[PDB]
Structure formats: C-alpha cells, structure tokens
Design a protein around this ligand. Sequence first.
Ligand SMILES: *[C@@H]1O[C@H](CO)[C@@H](O[C@@H]2O[C@H](CO)[C@@H](O)[C@H](O)[C@H]2NC(C)=O)[C@H](O)[C@H]1NC(C)=O
Ligand SMILES: *[C@@H]1O[C@H](CO)[C@@H](O[C@@H]2O[C@H](CO)[C@@H](O)[C@H](O)[C@H]2NC(C)=O)[C@H](O)[C@H]1NC(C)=O
Ligand SMILES: *[C@H]1O[C@H](CO)[C@@H](O[C@@H]2O[C@H](CO)[C@@H](O)[C@H](O)[C@H]2NC(C)=O)[C@H](O)[C@H]1NC(C)=O
Ligand SMILES: *[C@H]1O[C@H](CO)[C@@H](O[C@H]2O[C@H](CO)[C@@H](O)[C@H](O)[C@H]2NC(C)=O)[C@H](O)[C@H]1NC(C)=O
Ligand SMILES: *[C@@H]1O[C@H](CO)[C@@H](O)[C@H](O)[C@H]1NC(C)=O
Ligand SMILES: *[C@@H]1O[C@H](CO)[C@@H](O)[C@H](O)[C@H]1NC(C)=O
Ligand SMILES: *[C@@H]1O[C@H](CO)[C@@H](O)[C@H](O)[C@H]1NC(C)=O
Ligand SMILES: *[C@@H]1O[C@H](CO)[C@@H](O)[C@H](O)[C@H]1NC(C)=O
Ligand SMILES: *[C@@H]1O[C@H](CO)[C@@H](O)[C@H](O)[C@H]1NC(C)=O
Ligand SMILES: *[C@@H]1O[C@H](CO)[C@@H](O)[C@H](O)[C@H]1NC(C)=O
Ligand SMILES: *[C@@H]1O[C@H](CO)[C@@H](O)[C@H](O)[C@H]1NC(C)=O
Ligand SMILES: *[C@H]1O[C@H](CO)[C@@H](O)[C@H](O)[C@H]1NC(C)=O
Ligand SMILES: NCC1(c2ccccc2)CCCC1
Ligand SMILES: NCC1(c2ccccc2)CCCC1
Lengths: 728, 728
Amino acid sequence: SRRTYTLTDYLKSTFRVKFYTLQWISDHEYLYKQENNILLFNAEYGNSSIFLENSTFDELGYSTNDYSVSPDRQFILFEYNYVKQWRHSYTASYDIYDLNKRQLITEERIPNNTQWITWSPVGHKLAYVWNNDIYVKNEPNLSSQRITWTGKENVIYNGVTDWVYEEEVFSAYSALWWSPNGTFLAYAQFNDTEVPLIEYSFYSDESLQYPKTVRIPYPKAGAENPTVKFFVVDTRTLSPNASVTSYQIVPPASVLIGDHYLCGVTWVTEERISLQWIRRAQNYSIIDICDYDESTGRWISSVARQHIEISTTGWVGRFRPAEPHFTSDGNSFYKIISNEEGYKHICHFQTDKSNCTFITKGAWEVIGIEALTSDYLYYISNEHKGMPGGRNLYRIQLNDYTKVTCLSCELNPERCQYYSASFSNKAKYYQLRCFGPGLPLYTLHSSSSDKELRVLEDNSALDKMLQDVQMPSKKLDVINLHGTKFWYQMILPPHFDKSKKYPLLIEVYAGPCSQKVDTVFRLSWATYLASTENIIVASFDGRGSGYQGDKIMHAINRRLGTFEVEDQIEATRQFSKMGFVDDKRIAIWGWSYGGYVTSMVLGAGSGVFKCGIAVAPVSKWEYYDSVYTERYMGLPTPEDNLDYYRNSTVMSRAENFKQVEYLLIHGTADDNVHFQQSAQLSKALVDAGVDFQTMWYTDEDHGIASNMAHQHIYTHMSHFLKQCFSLP
Amino acid sequence: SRRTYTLTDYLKSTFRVKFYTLQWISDHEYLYKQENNILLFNAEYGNSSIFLENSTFDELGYSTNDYSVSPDRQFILFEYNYVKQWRHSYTASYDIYDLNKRQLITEERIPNNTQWITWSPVGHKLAYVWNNDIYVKNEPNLSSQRITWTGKENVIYNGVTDWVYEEEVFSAYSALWWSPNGTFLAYAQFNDTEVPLIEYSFYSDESLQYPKTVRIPYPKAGAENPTVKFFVVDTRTLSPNASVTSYQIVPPASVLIGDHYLCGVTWVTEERISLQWIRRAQNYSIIDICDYDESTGRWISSVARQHIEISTTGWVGRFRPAEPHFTSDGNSFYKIISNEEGYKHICHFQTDKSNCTFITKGAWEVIGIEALTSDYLYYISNEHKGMPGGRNLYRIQLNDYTKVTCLSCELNPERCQYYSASFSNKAKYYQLRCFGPGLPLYTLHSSSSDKELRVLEDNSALDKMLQDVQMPSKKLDVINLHGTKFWYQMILPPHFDKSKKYPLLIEVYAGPCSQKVDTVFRLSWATYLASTENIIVASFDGRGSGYQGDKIMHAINRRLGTFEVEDQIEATRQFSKMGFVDDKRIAIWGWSYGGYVTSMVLGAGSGVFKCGIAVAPVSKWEYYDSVYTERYMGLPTPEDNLDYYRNSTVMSRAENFKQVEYLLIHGTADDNVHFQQSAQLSKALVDAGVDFQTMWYTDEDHGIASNMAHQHIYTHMSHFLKQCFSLP
Ligand SMILES: *[C@@H]1O[C@H](CO)[C@@H](O[C@@H]2O[C@H](CO)[C@@H](O)[C@H](O)[C@H]2NC(C)=O)[C@H](O)[C@H]1NC(C)=O
Ligand SMILES: *[C@@H]1O[C@H](CO)[C@@H](O[C@@H]2O[C@H](CO)[C@@H](O)[C@H](O)[C@H]2NC(C)=O)[C@H](O)[C@H]1NC(C)=O
Ligand SMILES: *[C@H]1O[C@H](CO)[C@@H](O[C@@H]2O[C@H](CO)[C@@H](O)[C@H](O)[C@H]2NC(C)=O)[C@H](O)[C@H]1NC(C)=O
Ligand SMILES: *[C@H]1O[C@H](CO)[C@@H](O[C@H]2O[C@H](CO)[C@@H](O)[C@H](O)[C@H]2NC(C)=O)[C@H](O)[C@H]1NC(C)=O
Ligand SMILES: *[C@@H]1O[C@H](CO)[C@@H](O)[C@H](O)[C@H]1NC(C)=O
Ligand SMILES: *[C@@H]1O[C@H](CO)[C@@H](O)[C@H](O)[C@H]1NC(C)=O
Ligand SMILES: *[C@@H]1O[C@H](CO)[C@@H](O)[C@H](O)[C@H]1NC(C)=O
Ligand SMILES: *[C@@H]1O[C@H](CO)[C@@H](O)[C@H](O)[C@H]1NC(C)=O
Ligand SMILES: *[C@@H]1O[C@H](CO)[C@@H](O)[C@H](O)[C@H]1NC(C)=O
Ligand SMILES: *[C@@H]1O[C@H](CO)[C@@H](O)[C@H](O)[C@H]1NC(C)=O
Ligand SMILES: *[C@@H]1O[C@H](CO)[C@@H](O)[C@H](O)[C@H]1NC(C)=O
Ligand SMILES: *[C@H]1O[C@H](CO)[C@@H](O)[C@H](O)[C@H]1NC(C)=O
Ligand SMILES: NCC1(c2ccccc2)CCCC1
Ligand SMILES: NCC1(c2ccccc2)CCCC1
C-alpha cells in the first residue's frame, strides 16, 4: 500500500543520506562543521567546545564553501567564490582570519583566482599558486614571495598539474609538497609546449553573441606528452632581496631513457624525500629515495636506495603504482605490490636493500595501507567472507605478521560490510565509515582498547523516512564463466515474485580494474527503476575488473573492447535463462567506459539486447588521452598495437546497430571524453544507414552534473527505457 | 492495387524528372550537353552538329562537372576537381582546350584551387581569382597578369564575395564584371578586418586525431560589417612591365553618410556603368550611372544620372532592390519598383531625369524583366487567373503599353501554369520552361512567329513510370484571415475520401517575401507522406509572404515572429474544422526560417499542434547575420528595435513546449544558421524542465545534403512523425 521510490525522489534527493566529515588536527582532537559552526571535539572525553561561531561566516562576500585551520591553530583560511574547472581543479578567493585577535587580515591578501593554497605542516606559513606561479607567505599579514617566474597559460604549470596529470596521474590539481617541519617546499613543473590542443565551442549564457572557443593542451594516444621537472625549494632563505634557493632532482637513468611520468611524492623526514617515476609504457616504475646533503644543499640519490617494480603481463599497480609508507626513522617502508600468485599484498622494504618480505598473503587483496605506528600497520582489504566487493579495516603486528586482527568485520556484520577509515595523528583514534549494505554508519574508535567511543551519525532520520516506502532489495551472488567465478548484483523490485517475468537493465562500467559489484548503499536511478517501474537492474564484473588478482585484471591487456565486452554478453545470457527475466525486454546502459562497453555490446549482434543507452562514451581509443589509453593498449603504431586499436572502435560495428534501439548522449563541453567521440560515432551510423536517437547537452562537461541537466538526462533516459520496455 | 510512392522512391530518386539545360552563344545558336557530348543546335533549322565528342572528357583527371566555351568559339574551359564551400562558392581546377588545333593548353595553366574564372564577353580573354587576388590572361597559352596584391585569407577579398555578400547581397561568389567589348574589368574588394569570427569544430574523417576549428568572418545583427570598394580596371594597358590602370568609383554622398552595401553592377555600354548602392538600414537605395571620361580615364557621375528609391513602410525591393535593364543606347532603362498601391510593376526611366512612367499596373506583380529589344519588353508575372503562385511570360510593346501579349498562358493551361524563360541574344528565340502543376515541359520558341519550334523534353518517360503508381493530388485554394484572402495548398492522399479523418502535417517556411504555395511539380517527402502514409500535407502563405503587394509583405516589418507565426496557427485552425482532418493529430515542420516559425508555433500554447520538427532553425535574431536580420528588424539597440528582438526569441516560449512533442535537428558545421542557435534553444528547454528529442548531424552544413545524411534525416523524421500520429 505504501509509496514507491520515485524518479522525483531521486532527482530531488528527497531522501537525504547523512555523513560525518571531520578533520584531525592532533592525535586526539578533531574539527567538525556543525550548523556552520566549527566545533573542536576531544576524542578522549567526547566533550566539545566552539572553535568558531556560526556568526563569523555571515559576511565573507557570500557562501563560504570551505575552511582550513593552520596547524598551530593561530589562523584559519576561508575559501569562497568557487569556480570549477576540470574534475579536481578550480580557482577561488581566500580570506585569512586571525584566531587570536579574532580579526580578518586585510592587508597583503591572497589573490583572486587562486589555483591552490595550503598551510605548511607546522606553524602558519602559506604557499599558493596563482597564474601558474608559486608564492610563499611566511606571515598572513606580510607580503608573499614569488618562487617561480615561468608560469604561462596553457604552457607552463608550476605547483599545479596540467590536464592529463590531473586526470590520470595525480588525481589532484595540487603539485606542491611541504616537508614535515616546513623547511622545504617541493613542487613539480609541467611543460605543455608541444602537446596538441583539443578545441571546442562553449556557448555560455544566452546573451553572448559569439560562442567562445575553449583550448586545452590534451595529449591523445601516441601524441606528444607534457614533460616534467621536480624541484625542492629551501624556504629558509626566502627573502625579498634574495634569489630562490632550489635544487632539481632528475629521475634515475633507467627512466630518462625515454618519455616518463612523475607519479608520486612522499616526504620521509626533513632530509629524505621519496620520488616514484614510471616509464611512458607504464610497466616499469622506480622509487628513488633522495637524501639532503647539508654541506652543499643537494639532494643525492644512490642505486642502493632505488627500488624497481615491473610488470610482464600488463601494467604496474591498479591505476598507478601504489604509494610507499615509510617508518618514522625512514629506514624501511611498506608498500602494496603483486605477489607470486598475482594478488596484491603488503611487502616490507628496507630503504637500502632490494629484497622485500610479504607480510600478508592469500586469494584476496589489500586495498590500501591506512596507518603505520612502530607497533602496528592498519590496512583495508576484501578478505572477509572472500567477498571482493567488501571492505574492512585490519591491523597487523609488525613484530609478528601472524597476529592480524579485523577491527570492523563483526561490528555490524549485516548492516556493514564496506568500510573506509580515518586515523588521527600517531593512530591513537580513528573514525570508521560504513557505506553499506545497510544505511551508512559513522563511528569513533580508540586504537588502544578497540572500543567504540561513540556513534557520530547513524542516519536514523533516513531510516524513518524509508520504512514508509517500498524499497527494492539488492542481492549479490556468483556465476561461472570460463571456469572462473565472477560476481554480479541485482536490484530487485519490491515484493519480488520469482514467478512473473521482469524486464532487465544491465548497468555497466567494465573498464580495467573496475568494480561495479559491491556492498555500498546507494539511492540511485536504479532504485527508482526497480521500486516504481518494476525493472530488474543488474551489474557484472568479468575479465578486466579489479580486486581479484592480476590474472583477471590483466586479461584485457592490449585488447580493450574484447573480453570485458564479451563477458557482459555471456553473463546477461545466463541471467536471461533464470525464469524471472523477460528475455524480450533486456537493455544496457553506461557512462564513459560504461558507454563504450554498452556500445560495443549493442554492436556485437548477439541478439540478446533490445535497446541501450550510452552517455559520453569513448568510441575510438586513438581519441582518448595518452596516459590512460597507452597504459592498457600500448602505442597505436604498426610496430606496436595498431591492429587492436583499429578493430576495437565502435564504428567498425556500425552495421549491427540496425538490430537495436540506441540512445547516444554527450555534453558538448566534455573536456575528458571529447564530443568528437560521439560526433564520429554518429557519423558512422548515419553513413551505415542506421537509425538511432541522439541527445546533446549544451555546455555540460563530463559529469553532465548541473542541477537542470542532471534532472533532464535521467528523465529522458527513463522515457526511452519505458518506450523500449513497453511500460506505461 | 498499384504501388504507392515510397520513402525509398524519394530518397533514391527512383523516379527521375528530366530537364533541358542549354547555353545560348548567339542570337540563333545554343550548346547542349547530351551523353557527355557538346552539340551545337541551330534554333532556325533545328539541325545540330557535334561540337565536342564525348571522347575528349575521357581523360581530364576524372569527372568534368562543367564546361564554358569562349565567345569567339576558339577555346573551351573544363571545370573539374570541384570543392564546395558555402551556398554558391567553391574552388576548382581548370583546363583550357584549344578548339582549333584540337589540343590541350599545357603551359601557363590555370592555378589549382581557383575561386572564380570567366571569359570576357567577346574574344577569348580570361579573368580569374586565386588566393583572393585577380589575374588576367589575354591568351590561353600566355602568362597571366596579377591585378591585385592585397588578397588575404579571411581578411581581403578581390573579385569574390565574403560570407555575407555571397549569402545575402549578391547570391553569388562572383564579384567580377567584364565590360561588353572586354576593354574594362570591374571588380569589388571586400575588407573583413573588423568583422567578428564565428568558430565551430569540423571533425572530418574518422582518421583525424584532433578536430580542426573553422573560422569565418560572419557579422551578426548589429555587429561590425565588411567594408567595400569598387574598381574599374582598364585592361588595354595590362603588360608584365606596366602597373595596373584602375579607377575607384565611390558611392553618392547620400550613401557615404554611414555603413552601406554595393548590391548591383550593370554595364550599359563600353563607357557607361550602373552601380546600385543601399544604406545599411536598407530602406534607401540609389542607382549611380557613371560615364567614362576618355581624356582622364575617370568614371564620372552626376546628380542628374542618380535615381533614388526608398521605402517608408519597410525595405526596398524583395530581398534586394530590383536590377535596372538598359536600352542599347543606354539613354533609358526599365526597372521594377513598387507603385502607388504597393504592387511591384515595371517603370520606364530616363537616364538623366528623375521621373518614371509605369508601363504595367494591377493587383498582381511583375516577377522580373527577362529580355529587352528596341520594340518589346519580355517579363514574368503572376497576373494570369489572379494566381500569385503562378508564373507566365508576357511581352509588351514599348511604343504602346496597351499591347501586351501572354506568350505562355494558353500553351498547356492544365499542365503548365508556372514558367521561367531563357532568351537568345537579341531575343530572337527563347526556351520556355514549365515546372508544373503537371510534369515539367521544355520547349523552344521563335520571337517573330511565337510559334513553338519544338519539344526539347516532355518527361514522357516519367509519365510512364508514374501511371503505375498511386500518386497523391495537389489542390490549391483560398481562405480569409482579417478580411484578406490568402492562398494555401494541400497534398492529398490517393483515393481521398472526404469522409475519413486524416492526420495533418503543416509544412511551413513563412519568412519575409516567401512563397510555399505555388503550382510547381515536386517529387518530395510530402509525396511519400500522402501516398504511402495517408497523411495530408498543407502549406499556407499569410502575412509577410510575397508576390501579393507590399501591404501583405511589409506586415511583419520590425516584428518577425508575430503575424506570420499567428497566421499559420489560425489557418491550421480553419483547416482542422474541415471535416476530413483529425484535430487530435496535427503536426508542423520547417527548415531555417521555417524551423523558427515551426518552433514559435509549437511554443505558442495554441493547443492546436501535437508535435513538430525543426531543422536548422533560427532561435534568436541576434544570432543571425546583419544583412538579412537588420533588413526586417532594424538594429538591436534600445534606441531602435531591441524590445522586439528580445520578445521574439524561441527561448522566451520554452515553458509552452511541455505541451508538445518536439524534434530539434541541426548540422554541426552549419555556417549559415550556426549550431549555436539550436544549442542555445535546447539549453533553455533543459533549464525549463521540458522534455524533447534532438538529432545532430556531424559535419553537415546548412543543407544537410550529403547522400547519407539526406537519407538519414528524412528516415528519422518519418519515424518521429509516425510515432506521433500512431501510424504503424
Ligand atoms: C580484433 O581482432 C582479433 C583478431 O582476430 C580478435 O581476436 C580473436 O577474437 C576471437 C573471438 O571472436 C577469439 O576466438 C580469438 O581467440 C581471438 N584471437 C586473438 C588473437 O586474441 C578480437 O576479438 C577483435 N577485437 C574486437 C574488439 O572485436
Ligand atoms: C582593411 O580595413 C582596415 C580597417 O579596419 C584597414 O586598417 C586600417 O588601415 C589604416 C590605414 O592603413 C590604419 O591607419 C589603421 O590603423 C588600420 N586599422 C586597423 C583596424 O587595422 C586596412 O588597411 C584595410 N585593408 C585594405 C586592403 O583595404
Ligand atoms: C549556528 O549555531 C546555532 C547552534 O549553536 C544554530 O542553531 C541550531 O539550529 C538547529 C537547526 O538549524 C537547531 O536544531 C538547534 O537546536 C539550534 N540550536 C540552538 C542554539 O537553538 C544556528 O542555526 C546556527 N546559525 C546559522 C547560521 O544557522
Ligand atoms: C511581443 O512584443 C509585443 C509586446 O506587446 C507583442 O504585442 C503585439 O502583438 C499582440 C498580439 O497578441 C497585440 O495584441 C499587441 O497589440 C501588439 N503590441 C503592439 C505594441 O502592437 C508581440 O506580439 C510580441 N512578439 C512576440 C514575437 O511574441
Ligand atoms: C574536555 O573536558 C576535559 C576535562 O574532562 C578538559 O581537560 C578538556 O580541555 C575538554 N576538551 C574540550 C571540549 O576542548
Ligand atoms: C618548455 O618546453 C619547450 C619545448 O621543449 C622548450 O622550448 C621551453 O624552453 C620549455 N620551457 C621551460 C620553462 O622549461
Ligand atoms: C629590499 O630591497 C628594497 C629595495 O630594493 C628595500 O626597500 C628593502 O628595505 C630591502 N629589504 C630588506 C630585507 O632589507
Ligand atoms: C614493457 O612494455 C613494453 C612496451 O611494449 C614492452 O615492449 C616490454 O616487453 C614490456 N616489458 C615487460 C617487463 O613486459
Ligand atoms: C544546319 O544546316 C544548315 C544548312 O542549310 C547550316 O547552314 C547550319 O550551319 C546547320 N546547323 C548547324 C550549325 O549545325
Ligand atoms: C619585362 O620585364 C621582364 C622582367 O624583368 C624582362 O625580362 C623583360 O625583358 C621586360 N620586357 C621588355 C624587354 O620590355
Ligand atoms: C529608414 O530605416 C531606418 C531603420 O531604423 C529608420 O531609422 C529610418 O527612419 C527609415 N527612414 C525611412 C525613409 O523609412
Ligand atoms: C558519346 O556520344 C556518342 C554519340 O554517337 C554515343 O553513341 C556514345 O554512347 C557516348 N559515349 C558515352 C557514354 O560517353
Ligand atoms: N580517466 C580515467 C577514467 C575514464 C576512462 C575512460 C573514459 C572516461 C574516464 C577511468 C577511471 C576514472 C575515469
Ligand atoms: N539568408 C537567406 C534565407 C534564410 C533566412 C533565414 C534563415 C535561413 C536562411 C532567406 C531566403 C533564402 C535563405
């Protein structure tokens, strides 16, 4: 009799899922923004005090989207006037507020359009990037000092990444790294002089008479890449009438051979920095640990402190090589790498020795190292119940790898199987974050007694609202393909009657090291399709997917568009044989890589799918960026992998689309998967005489995330889907 | 029992409509390309001879799309390697073939990428434009002489028009004019230095890794326009070691005041040239007749030889002021202008007097003056039967305006009501071209006996094919609106049963001075919709339409988007009341201006239309070019017509689209109605929460005319239409 989860409920977020975001500022204290008030909580006693009243934000231009308190707690930074750029980058305005004299620094302010800013790890120094140059302010009220002079739009980047490093290498816009005690400021410089430009029209507000052309240095497969340099600036000598004292650290010879990338920076101590470089091929990476020479100011490296990591069956790491986690002394480190069996586990390395020792093993994988003390190492893995789509926090004794405890496994076995964690300094306390399968749950714990100090947020409000509505259920299970067991999930309609025949909707991603099958709780479009439209929405992780060993992940090496596409078809074929699926009404959709896979499926002529929707899909790999594409496909030259580049385009399967109903969608301002991709795909379908539907979204980028576009696209795909399934 | 005219029949042109293209080369001879053979016909005796065997084209690179024989018949020009640009412009390669020594000129050839080329009116001189500069060749085998040095891509144009002059002023790419006896070569120079650039992406062949950006100097409403200069070059002194002798003719002071355009050039005699200029406003034009001064080389003008033409209720002429037609002596001319009642008729002017005398009158209009001898004047009008959508050839005695004969009216009253004509030199013979309502019919006639020498093409083959198929019928009639009678047409399905109720498709254009209702025979998409899908396709010419007097045409002056849109709604409303139309299923579609109107109707909230399709529509007048837009709307400034510019956008009616099914289509490479227009329109619909369909066509220009795109768009609109009409 109750209501169903509606499209409007989804599009409007009428069912709010709460969370708990905190920032640790010591080994037992943390800040929390509550009702626009910044409160200081003491993990020990649970008591809190007001750190900054809600009545201070009231007048800072307008909305204050973010804050950052200096480590010495003397100042606070206010971020506002946010202007988004790519996936991670953006520019903003900042105000510095003196917490002592409780005033607002007015002289020597931070520039407008600041690209990045950060306090030093200690004290209250500031470093920021503006107009592609780096500046340092020793005091909030004193004049900043310019560190670089080469900054230049679309050419030289100091302190921040260019387009490709942001998206594929750093997964961040930032390229600045203060040393632990603020002595040194390390940064990377990117040169895009020889990178070709992708250009597209941005129409802007209706009042703009002429469209403007956006230009981005974007390297497509096999094109010229940006070069990079790494510098360590000694901030001690920074003065208005002094030059900048900096040293340039170059990569090891084994990398200087040809094109390469800087993929990681980690400070070990005030005089020891760790750099991780990888060759353009991405099957050879190396860690170079450089020591500061106090009598020359040089950062020296030695072959003894270099650690090589290669891959013979594919690429190194998941999306990039894993980061090293050093001990306080810096004489050793722990890092995730592939073991003998192809599973990723933690290996213990000695800084000046090449041999490492695995401290974990099994047919499961370590997702990442979370914290490290002199006695324990905390990490996250999907070992529990052997569920690759589950996550838990584990702790292992460093003096006896035999003693490993699961800190999250049994807290709420039914409600919580997917966690992430955030540790305080020195790992004395930690917040545990549960994302499903039940309602998210945030908790605070002590590392000494493993006791649960308290419940930070349990979403009891959401629970209330949902018991009044007919929610669908999510079931996870397994099936066999090629003698290998793979996972899949199904969002089943309320009051699921294994008798009736329901229409199926396959939602796919399926890109290298992907995971669409997990135990995370999500109020999604699928929630609505199952709840209101009685459609079954399933997902499957086959060959190429991650967190199940290099064996399954590297299956699609140098051959994207083959096995992962084929496995979606065979898995759907097995789903359609289970009596509760109307094989006459099967569809599939995806975004990005899921859009590519969706298209490849539809064009396979399997006769299995009736219709499909592709949103901002890749259509030809030579159109995508160099870092991501080459990592799996090599170079598109007749000497390397051109043949597999050519027969993996969606265009080459155009004729087969005559057998299905296809919906192609794309944002005209997509800086990531260029509109070109869909423009070229549609032209191939037109030339083949194939009828299909289209939908462009003016000025929307890769996310197609503006409030109105977001609502419009899901509304549109719903009509298309219901038309195809003959649903009223 | 027979077949119906199918979509495939239309898309593939299975039913060929033949024509007869000839080129007059004297007062009694003409050339005709037959089976790749150039034959020379003698109108007098009807006998023909081979002028150039089909066996000469065989090897000229490849296909020879066109030929041009010099007037002295000594040479012939072969055009090939055609590369289209805008609506009229294109570049090509040319070979000169010596008809005497029957050889092929090999030395001093014509450049590749030639923009325009033409023989002189006599002899065998040649003038051509290459890289925006003019060149003259006195002999096919001799070196050409460069005439201009200012040529520059997207900036200076010598001898050819820029984008806006090509599309809106000259309706041609050409800007060169030889004098009657080849002495002088006149040309216009266009400067686009200050014209803003419209830019858009061209994706090209799938193999192009990066899309290229096309840039065109295009002036939008109120923007900076291109300036122009007119020169008369004396070719007699052209020599390799001599400078160029030329004179610059400037416009009359009444035009130099502000911005203006050169809209017409006409040579009167070897020493008298006629220039027609118009102000940017386009409600004031003037004809300046300049005489050559043999002792100074100057081209002099006098106030006595100037003729002003203004409009107080709108703009001058139809799309541009009509051209003057001078007598051999050049002492007088005949030109179409609006009379006292607002109807366009022929006025007789004296070159040095300001008063003219109308030689025709009535509630009908003269379409154009076709030929002029010392005894008669031939013209075309829609006077017959008072049908504004009919055309006929008339002849009027110059010494007695009372004697006027209709030469085409009664030849085939049932089969032919729409003619055009082509006269030989001195008007001794003429070809008559009938375009409907029956099958096209070409005939050759003598001016002396008005006798029909012979039938050039009667399409008897097409007649044969069509009697085997169920063709629809076209009926023309009238209806009253605001006390004024307007015309409309309906393509009725075969075996039309005035009983049953059929869905109605309204095909609209309705732009200023347009005519959708005529008696021309057309194998169109509508032919298929009526014949096979049993849909009625109607068209209506209301306020704003042409050929019915300035009264009706100037109705929409300074207010586009109002009356012509409203009249389509009221006329459809009256059509729906006629018992044979299903009021529940009515649609409307259009192209360009028809797309605008179509969209303005769908957004009127009249409740009359269920669905509609708009192809490459204008959505906001400030986005269209200056010449066309300003002609009807004035300037978009608060001092002029900004208010009507703002409330006539399609966007302002977005909310109303929630009541209809809308299909928006646009070529991404449209240089005319920029993709911007539809991009901005769709964004307004998305912001309003309106659901609608879309369809972009990669790299297609304004015509969307590539073979595959052509077939695809009509196939797509047919599915949309049938979905909306619930037709299987
Ligand atoms: C591209 O072409 C290759 C080579 O023909 C395809 O690889 C074969 O795929 C078939 C599946 O139909 C397998 O039976 C063979 O074992 C494969 N051979 C190799 C060399 O792996 C590949 O599937 C094609 N890729 C795409 C995207 O269609
Ligand atoms: C094309 O038109 C532009 C006007 O914009 C001319 O440029 C001006 O030329 C004069 C004289 O040389 C200079 O004093 C101005 O400074 C120029 N202004 C600009 C906008 O550049 C240009 O010379 C013209 N070219 C031709 C071939 O006529
Ligand atoms: C700043 O802080 C006060 C609390 O100290 C906020 O007041 C609370 O508001 C929530 C709902 O918004 C109530 O449920 C609490 O009970 C309120 N507490 C009090 C003091 O009554 C106040 O809303 C905040 N100011 C702003 C900017 O909204
Ligand atoms: C918007 O501009 C004017 C503003 O009123 C509109 O008004 C005109 O058209 C009406 C038709 O409903 C007439 O009733 C008004 O009298 C007439 N106003 C004037 C001053 O003559 C006009 O129609 C609108 N144009 C568009 C495109 O919507
Ligand atoms: C919490 O209370 C303790 C005493 O039990 C005090 O020492 C501490 O400073 C307080 N922490 C806060 C809320 O800052
Ligand atoms: C950027 O790279 C280009 C191309 O190699 C080079 O010419 C230029 O000097 C470099 N600039 C800097 C600041 O490194
Ligand atoms: C730095 O130099 C400027 C003049 O160039 C001078 O005004 C200022 O006093 C100097 N600062 C220091 C550190 O003395
Ligand atoms: C590393 O990748 C390159 C790129 O093709 C390849 O030639 C080489 O064999 C690879 N090396 C390993 C360790 O597999
Ligand atoms: C037709 O024949 C006549 C002979 O009476 C001749 O004069 C004429 O040139 C011929 N027509 C042509 C040009 O083929
Ligand atoms: C014309 O100029 C050319 C180029 O300098 C020269 O070779 C030629 O002799 C000149 N013609 C004469 C002789 O007048
Ligand atoms: C000519 O047209 C312009 C266009 O705005 C107008 O301002 C001017 O008054 C008009 N004059 C005549 C003769 O109609
Ligand atoms: C060219 O014309 C001749 C005329 O005799 C004709 O017979 C021949 O078929 C034609 N050749 C072609 C197809 O070009
Ligand atoms: N850029 C890497 C990703 C991608 C791949 C193909 C297409 C779009 C986006 C894959 C993982 C995050 C985004
Ligand atoms: N520009 C001239 C035309 C037009 C008008 C509006 C929109 C597109 C095209 C009007 C007549 C021919 C084409």
